[PDB]
Design a protein around this ligand. Structure first.
Ligand SMILES: [Zn+2]
Ligand SMILES: [Zn+2]
Ligand SMILES: [Zn+2]
Length: 178
């Protein structure tokens, strides 16, 4: 196995996947690493199995159809993995925990949102459709853009949203367009 956490790139108390070389901190994996289960397969492995069992799941889809899907187990898993893909970027630190807002010339968002809140909402099965999860995720970046206005710090929201959007298109096999 790997000697660092796949998500945060630090050593520590690591749980090792049995079907690939990745390792994880307990709460870096999503879902949190399962208590028993020998062997244990990580989320990357579980996502790969879905594709292999239904090759046609990789043909192009329309975003509007994807968002209306019910959060059955496979969609739940895909949203977990997309969330994990954002935490994999170090710039996710800025959007992880509950923000606060006191900047001259700006007002905080009406509906604050952050990664750990989305993590909890997945864990607690609070989303009934993919649209719920994607809306909260895009809301994180949109709040940041509006609040920071012309400060160059706005760019951090563009950068992390780009990671989200590329991974969304990959994981849910969105039809490629020009
Ligand atoms: Zn970690
Ligand atoms: Zn694995
Ligand atoms: Zn099939």
């Amino acid at each position: 196995n790997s000697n660092i956490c796949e998500v945060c790139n630090k050593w520590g108390r690591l749980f090792c996947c049995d079907t690939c070389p990745r390792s994880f901190h307990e709460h870096c994996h999503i879902p949190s690493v399962e208590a028993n289960k020998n062997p244990w397969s990580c989320i990357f492995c579980r996502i790969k199995t879905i594709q292999e069992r239904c090759p046609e799941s990789q043909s192009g889809h329309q975003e509007s159809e994807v968002l209306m899907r019910q959060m059955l187990p496979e969609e739940q898993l895909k949203c977990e993995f997309l969330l994990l893909k954002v935490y994999c970027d170090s710039k996710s630190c800025f959007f992880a925990s509950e923000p606060y807002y006191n900047r001259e010339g700006s007002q905080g968002p009406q509906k604050p949102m952050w990664l750990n809140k989305v993590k909890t909402s997945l864990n607690e099965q609070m989303y009934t459709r993919v649209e719920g999860f994607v809306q909260d995720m895009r809301l994180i970046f949109h709040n940041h853009k509006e609040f920071y206005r012309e400060d160059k710090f706005t760019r951090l929201g563009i950068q992390v949203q780009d990671i989200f959007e590329k991974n969304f298109r990959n994981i849910f096999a969105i039809q490629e367009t020009s």
